[PDB]
Amino acid sequence: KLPNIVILATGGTIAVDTLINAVPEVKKLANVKGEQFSNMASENMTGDVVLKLSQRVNELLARDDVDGVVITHGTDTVEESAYFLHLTVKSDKPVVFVAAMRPATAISADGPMNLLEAVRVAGDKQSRGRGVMVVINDRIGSARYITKTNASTLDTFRANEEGYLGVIIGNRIYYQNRIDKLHTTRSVFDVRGLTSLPKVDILYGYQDDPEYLYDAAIQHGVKGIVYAGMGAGSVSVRGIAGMRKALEKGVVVMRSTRTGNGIVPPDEELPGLVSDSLNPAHARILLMLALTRTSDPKVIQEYFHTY
Template sequence: MNKKYLSKTMAALMLCTSFASFANADKPTVKIYATGGTIAGSSESNMDTTDYKAGKIGVDLLISAVPELKDFAHVIGEQIANTDSNNINQNILLKLSKAINLQLADAKTSGVVVTHGTDTLEETAFFLDLTVKSDKPVVIVGAMRPATAISADGGMNLLEAVRLASDDDAKHRGAMVVLNDRIGSAFYTTKTNSTMLDTFKATEQGYLGAFLSGEPHFYYEPTKPVDKPYFDISHVKQLPKVKILYSYQDQDPALLHAAIKDGAKGIVIAGTGNGSLSDVMLEAVKETMDKGIPVVRSTRTGNGFVTPKQEGIGSGVYNPQKAKVLLSLALAHGDNLKTIRNYFEN
């Protein structure tokens, strides 16, 4: 090859690289932590929205599939896991939270995005809301349709999540959930429908904002949920085992006793109505509490406040799955029964 031509080509490439670096320097940096889920799912049929395989697409392909991301941020990615969200465990949660805390401590990072399966997305989002100490945005995003489906929602959801994570107005709002053009507080948002796109809601508390043509618009100034705790998990290697039991007519305490025998350090019960239980279960709860094992009484209704209890601990605003997350963090923190009660019933 002509040396003069090669020299000009190399100079042009260096100029392009320098220009790209300069352009990226002017844009906020957002890191995406990928864990798998439907947003990374695929199927042989583009009509399939229920029987696909979750966690089949890597973070690099997710990023490259939405080239518009680079218009708003310098995006980097890390694959924390690539699995169905029902396989997310405490090891992944602890690794993820620690990584995010370190990343957000970097002055060059504007915010982070976590891609996640929707089935347990609210639990991871809530866990991060209680364990990430930063004013910068943490955005958890997923999809209800796999990447291979007609009208797949993952691409737009990811674009909106990155835009939110790079937006100065998103600071001081805690962790947020983004799907279906909605911005929700991770503290309150829950999955309310098994298959429909508009599944993530906070029925009582509402949304923080919404997207219009991919641009975030907030309804309120930054605010913080009342009595939201923070837990430092930087040195936590394992979370204590907490079990969730479901309440029903003619329930007996056999599963409660079995959970304790299996090593549970705390129990959450999805009770009926306002955390109601049968007389025989109330007696078992009292005995369990007397042994120093906290029992939190939530509700299976999917919504509402569970008031303070004499037998056990009323869950307050926390549904069973979020009560489990909070209780496990409190136990890992070494809190006593009185302190734990205050987290829920305050």
């Protein structure tokens, strides 16, 4: 009859028991059991905690008595945590992240409805093999493309060029797309038996950008640097000098964009690698994981075109 869903809470203004007792209708959709993983605002989520989360989810999905998992998280960095598990979960079972833009105590709070939709999505057989998803505001987005585009609105999560995987209207799921990238069960990345991740920082691009910020990053032991550049990863003379110093020290430089959408195309005349359509936040996640398997720039560049 009903599928077994585990609700793993990590924090956020949305929620775990109380949360569940707030919308009992979920009991009509599946057999739920809640587990408190942590309780912190997403702005304080760290790589080591995300790493533990990924490991815990792989453990649960290995069980025969678990059909899917729903994860409550804060909205601010959910695109970072979601993409990490998108690349590290070794199962076709549904992993759904859910969040809320208004606190549970607010008038017309969105959390209750988002949670109900998240459970319905995770328990549906149609949801298997689609990669990690983020459910909110009646939409279903892919971890690889979804990002928070507005600071304070309910409809903040969008993928302008890629669209949504599907939508939920009238308690029915309408799947529209399947992403054409590698993920989950077909990913080469595995963090089981790992307890630490390579250090990667992000530097911004703008008029008068300082070369000294690069010096500080290098001296503090970074293994990689993601550049949120102007336009299509364009670099000033000061940025070029800073990138050269990094390259001599064995640090991997990845050029992305501050614009918010689009493709950063390769350019033999500029230093570093290019991020494809990955934004700064997503690019950092993939670079950290890539560095746990290799340091060859040719191999890393290919990961960015396929993941």
